[PDB]
Amino acid sequence: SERDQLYYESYSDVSVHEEMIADQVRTEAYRLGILKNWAALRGKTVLDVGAGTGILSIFCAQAGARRVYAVEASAIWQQAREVVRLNGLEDRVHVLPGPVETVELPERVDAIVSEWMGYGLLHESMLSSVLHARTKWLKEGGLLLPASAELFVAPISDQMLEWRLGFWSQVKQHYGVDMSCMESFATRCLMGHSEIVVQDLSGEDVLARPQRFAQLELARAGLEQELEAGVGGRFRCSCYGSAPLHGFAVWFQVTFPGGPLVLSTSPLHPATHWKQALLYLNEPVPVEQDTDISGEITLLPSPDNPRRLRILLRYKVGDHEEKTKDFAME
Amino acid sequence: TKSERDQLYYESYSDVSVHEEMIADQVRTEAYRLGILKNWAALRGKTVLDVGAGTGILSIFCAQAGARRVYAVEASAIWQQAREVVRLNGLEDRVHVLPGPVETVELPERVDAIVSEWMGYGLLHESMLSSVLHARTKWLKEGGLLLPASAELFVAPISDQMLEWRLGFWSQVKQHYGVDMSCMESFATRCLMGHSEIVVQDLSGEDVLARPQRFAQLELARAGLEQELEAGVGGRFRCSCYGSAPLHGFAVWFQVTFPGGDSEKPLVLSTSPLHPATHWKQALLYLNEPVPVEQDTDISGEITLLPSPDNPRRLRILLRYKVGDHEEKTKDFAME
Ligand SMILES: COC(=O)c1cc(O)c2cc(NC(=O)NCCCCNC(=N)NCC[C@H]3O[C@@H](n4cnc5c(N)ncnc54)[C@H](O)[C@@H]3O)ccc2c1
Ligand SMILES: COC(=O)c1cc(O)c2cc(NC(=O)NCCCCNC(=N)NCC[C@H]3O[C@@H](n4cnc5c(N)ncnc54)[C@H](O)[C@@H]3O)ccc2c1
């Protein structure tokens, strides 16, 4: 309650809603994903879980929803009421303040729309709120937007990290002072920790074919029990070539029903504010073409904080013995 | 507490990231390189104290400039890496890395010169200045050399184009997505401008609304400078706007100046938005809301850099200001 209240009012500031709507890959994907469901939303009722400024609710109205209930727990709900009023939709889009867990809707709804994903998919873990509203207020077999999330893992050779490690071998060319001996210290500092690092990679950093290691269907009942215990699964892949293996990037996509539109955070797709979630090994591990990497990745809430993402990594490079690493978000 | 702050600072400077930023800062590292090498005559065969040596790169520049002995004093765990950096370049006979605070180090001798890179954001936030002044009094010989010799503080009124774009962003949602969100503008201004925090951000010359005014100078060689630091480094200013724009507030930045010696022309390391970027960026002091001004609009007031009452290392800035015919206003800022 102390946490929930502190977590909600982190969204009472403009900067995080600005960043979300300024992410055009995200916002266009949601806009299209909603509008493309015009046939299934037309004449139907909708619950926007965590409506924020209310922009997703208004796309739902544009898709022909007859009513949208925009439920928002933080102070930003006042802005959304004015946005709705300003767009002339106060008769069809109803901003209700409070947590979706305890708000009273006038009715069960035909559809849920929500943008609930955090870093590494489940950090902040608003997903439990969405699934709570599904059970309580979505009608049987009702539409969820997006409908599902897919998790991906790929082994990586991070060019940024390389450049930072090799920075110390370059100081001589720049200023006449040799500093190559700092490299191992830079390695321990940048890789030896146990934090999930949130950073933008590109296709150049991907060391093998991405593997989908879990799918979460939002419409599947009892998925709330699974989240507390951890979701994820196993993977196996083979390296493209020779490079220092730095670890793994984890990312996700969300899929809207076809009416199929996919919002991807892959480093092979245009960048989003989510970037990717990097799991560095303690030190770089040389690999070559067809090196076999297998393992298991599990996304869990942290013991100390149920909204903080933790990731249990088990891996095995070639024949170098199975290792594990325990990661938590900063 | 102080033990909380000191442990957070040990841990920070014991980590590679902050040193990578300072050395990657080519404007800074190169100025110090030229500023030191330019003073070879003063430094040839003399002794040097490097206050806060970090990785030792400044102590090595000193040895490269002809110094016979350099004491490279560094309080964080990074002293161990600097010891290896000195050994790698074959300098451990001339450069001695000593761990710990400069306040408690014991040198074998007093020194001919002090070099230090001690400047925080807005010059004095997190400042190692008091460490440098303490080493000056205790270890520098009479008439010894200080590198850099001085710092100067500058203020300018600003129309921050990036801030403008964030303020107008909500007015541009409809053209992009069909949803009118221009009612958000007032709310965004309150968030982005209504706080009392100093914001550290890069600006360009396009942001500077009037001639930058130097309002203070710090001459490191002056004994009893220490008393001015606790009461306030500050000064008064007046300027006239270049043209029409919304006035968002003021930018504060600094330069430091190395003595000429061989060339007599003084090398300046600048953090002005008119000069190449550095990691110090600028300290922005936003008004509660934009104020429209035009060509030759008068702007005047007083700026005082102070320590915060709760934390002496945390920079506080008192801004008193007057825009044209508006009434004088004040706003009290602290670093986040
Ligand atoms: C100086 O600053 C820095 O340096 C900084 C550092 C960062 O690390 C920064 C990180 C950022 N990124 C970030 O924060 N999030 C990116 C993904 C987030 C995941 N959440 C999500 N999808 N958003 C929509 C959620 C909306 O639903 C509401 N809601 C929640 N539960 C509810 C419930 N039960 N009932 C009703 N309403 C509920 C919320 O109130 C909100 O309106 C941004 C800025 C950052 C800045
Ligand atoms: C037993 O020791 C502990 O447990 C300890 C105790 C402290 O109280 C600590 C206090 C710190 N605070 C601090 O650095 N604030 C500055 C922030 C902006 C300005 N920085 C800048 N422009 N360049 C930094 C250049 C290098 O100067 C070193 N240094 C700093 N002050 C020093 C001193 N008195 N003597 C010797 N070396 C000192 C740093 O470590 C750094 O590498 C850090 C670490 C500390 C460690």
Author numbering:
A (entry chain B): 44 to 302, 307 to 377
B (entry chain A): 42 to 377
What text does the study give?
Protein arginine methyltransferases (PRMTs) are important therapeutic targets, playing a crucial role in the regulation of many cellular processes and being linked to many diseases. Then, another series of compounds (12a–12h) were designed and synthesized, introducing also an adenosine moiety and exploring the distance between the three groups. We also report crystal structures with various PRMTs supporting the observed specificity and selectivity. On the contrary, we were able to cocrystallize the compounds in the complex with both PRMT4 and PRMT6.
Structure determinations and refinements revealed that only compounds 12a, 12c, and 12f are visible in the active site of each monomer of the PRMT6 dimer. In all the structures of the complexes with PRMT6, the electron density for the compound is always better in one monomer. Compound 12a is the only one for which a complete electron density is visible in one monomer of the PRMT6 structure, whereas for 12c and 12f the electron density becomes fragmented after the guanidine group and the density for the methyl-4-hydroxy-2-naphthoate moiety is weak. Moreover, for compound 12f, the active site of one monomer is occupied by both the compound and SAH. The crystal structure revealed an unusual distorted U-shaped conformation adopted by compound 12a (and probably also 12c and 12f) in the binding to PRMT6, with a folding at the level of the guanidine group. Whereas the adenosine moiety lies into its canonic binding pocket, the guanidine group of the compounds is unable to reach the PRMT6 double-E loop clamp because the linker with the sugar is too short, even for the longer compound 12f. Instead of binding in the arginine substrate pocket as observed with PRMT4, the methyl-4 hydroxy-2-naphthoate moiety is sandwiched between the adenosine and the side chains of Y50 and Y51 residues of the α helix motif I. Hence, the binding of compounds 12a, 12c, and 12f affects the proper folding of the PRMT6 alpha-X helix containing the motif I (Y50-Y51-X-X-Y54).
